[PDB]
Amino acid sequence: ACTKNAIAQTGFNKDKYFNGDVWYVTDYLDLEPDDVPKRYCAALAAGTASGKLKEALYHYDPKTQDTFYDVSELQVESLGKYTANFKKVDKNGNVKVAVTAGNYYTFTVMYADDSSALIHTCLHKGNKDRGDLYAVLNRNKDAAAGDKVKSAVSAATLEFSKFISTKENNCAYDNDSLKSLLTK
Numbered sequence: 058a059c060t061k062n063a064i065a066q067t068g069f070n071k072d073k074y075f076n077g078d079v080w081y082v083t084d085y086l087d088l089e090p091d092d093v094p095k096r097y098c099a100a101l102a103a104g105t106a107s108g109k110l111k112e113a114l115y116h117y118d119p120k121t122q123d124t125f126y127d128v129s130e131l132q133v134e135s136l137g138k139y140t141a142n143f144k145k146v147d148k149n150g151n152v153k154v155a156v157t158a159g160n161y162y163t164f165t166v167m168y169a170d171d172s173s174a175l176i177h178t179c180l181h182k183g184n185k186d187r188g189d190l191y192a193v194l195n196r197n198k199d200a201a202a203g204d205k206v207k208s209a210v211s212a213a214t215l216e217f218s219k220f221i222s223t224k225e226n227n228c229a230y231d232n233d234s235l236k237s238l239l240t241k
């Protein structure tokens with residue numbers, strides 16, 4: 058289970074974060090051992106559609122080739138803290154698994170600027186017992202983490218050396234599909 062109440066960035070700029078552009082995961086930290094594969098790749102687009110906060114997700118397993126997309130409408134708990142009911146979709150937005158109660162993740166933006174972010178997520182999916190996941194994001198694919206986000210990791214009392222890099226994995230990202238999904 059998840060154990061952290063992540064604190065959102067003071068003065069979080071929602072319009073800047075939810076601007077329709079893509080965020081690449083470059084490093085991640087799962088608090089529960091063996092909760093995720095050690096080699097993995099993910100990206101998301103966050104935006105607004107008709108005034109609703111939306112996220113489109115992309116997961117790619119560089120070994121198995123398992124690939125999946127999701128779309129969510131986000132509900133606001135407080136500035137920078139959201140609850141998201143996801144539907145699994147193909148890259149075109151065609152629904153493969155409908156929204157269902159108990160299938161949701163929380164999402165907290167702990168730090169963000171024009172190029173980088175640190176987020177916490179807690180995934181709830183059916184009978185899965187998942188744990189806390191932190192991710193360092195960048196606007197640029199596979200970019201090395203800058204001093205601002207690394208300092209934010211420290212300020213959150215996390216050790217960045219413990220994070221697992223995704224930058225060296227053979228991963229491709231369909232950024233065009235992610236952006237287009239924001240309306241799905």
Ligand code: HEM
Pocket residue numbers: 082084085092093094097098099101114116125126127143144145154161162164178180182192223
């Ligand atoms: C490198 C970072 C990440 C890794 C390694 C990772 C890993 C995984 C894995 C292994 C699964 C499949 C679990 C299963 O069904 O057995 C999964 C599903 C999922 N993850 Fe992530 N994830 C990452 C980033 C994220 C982020 C940033 C979010 C939210 C913004 C997210 C949200 C979800 C959701 C909603 C599902 C279920 C999707 C569905 O079943 O339709 N993940 N993730």
Ligand SMILES: O=N[O-]
Pocket residue numbers: 093178179180190
């Ligand atoms: O491990 N996906 O939150």
